[PDB]
Design a protein around this ligand. Sequence first.
Ligand code: FMN
Ligand code: FMN
Lengths: 117, 117
Amino acid sequence: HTFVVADATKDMAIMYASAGFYEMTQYGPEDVIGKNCRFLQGPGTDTEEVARIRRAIKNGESHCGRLLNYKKDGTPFWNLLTLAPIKNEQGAVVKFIGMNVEVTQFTEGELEKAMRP
Amino acid sequence: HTFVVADATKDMAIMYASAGFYEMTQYGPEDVIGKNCRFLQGPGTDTEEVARIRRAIKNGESHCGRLLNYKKDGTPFWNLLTLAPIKNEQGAVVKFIGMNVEVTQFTEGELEKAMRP
Ligand SMILES: Cc1cc2nc3c(=O)[nH]c(=O)nc-3n(C[C@H](O)[C@H](O)[C@H](O)COP(=O)(O)O)c2cc1C
Ligand SMILES: Cc1cc2nc3c(=O)[nH]c(=O)nc-3n(C[C@H](O)[C@H](O)[C@H](O)COP(=O)(O)O)c2cc1C
């Protein structure tokens, strides 16, 4: 579990983050709770992927996209961000969940372990 | 594990698929091994997301995107497809892995179970 929960009734502020998120990004709760996760973005982050994200959230749609993000120490990393709306019984969006995967090289070795009969 | 492995030295033909893939899509190995996974696409599949996928594969890049796909019975489903290149020691791309997530509604209930201290 690397994920965060954002509150649609407080302008998509992060209301919760998993332990994995703090460890992946190196930021602590003081930098995250109550904030918008756009703070991870930085030089080179793709403007059009960011716009796709924004639209998906506005439309209440699930989404995924690779985005460049930055750790607290300024290390760039690729983040496969998937997003899903959480609705109430009225069918209104009250939260979003986001799941963050830090891309690493997938090796022939790891594939063998994945495929091994 | 829902994933498939494609062989870059046989034009991205699927060389392996996990049990989860057969069950998610309802297709059997006879419809999958040796094929290109584009066969899951259909009416309404987003042309530009498909083009993003194509470019990522050509550039040897990791990627994610939501795509409409179809099960064997013709049921449409949203597929959060993530892709990652597998390189040899020369640094050349010899395979791709693809991981397929079938989007379902995420409920306030599921979130409570995810967040529950
Ligand atoms: C639940 C959730 C998680 C998010 N996680 C990230 C993330 O890890 N990295 C990131 O760059 N953007 C993330 N975002 C996206 C930003 O919060 C923001 O929605 C995006 O940059 C587009 O809006 P903007 O154009 O106002 O910045 C997340 C959004 C949501 C709703
Ligand atoms: C490993 C791997 C897995 C893929 N899985 C899917 C999938 O589940 N659904 C899909 O619609 N496309 C999938 N694709 C994408 C298609 O195979 C194809 O690359 C895409 O449609 C773009 O190429 P085209 O424009 O020639 O169709 C996958 C590709 C790779 C390499």
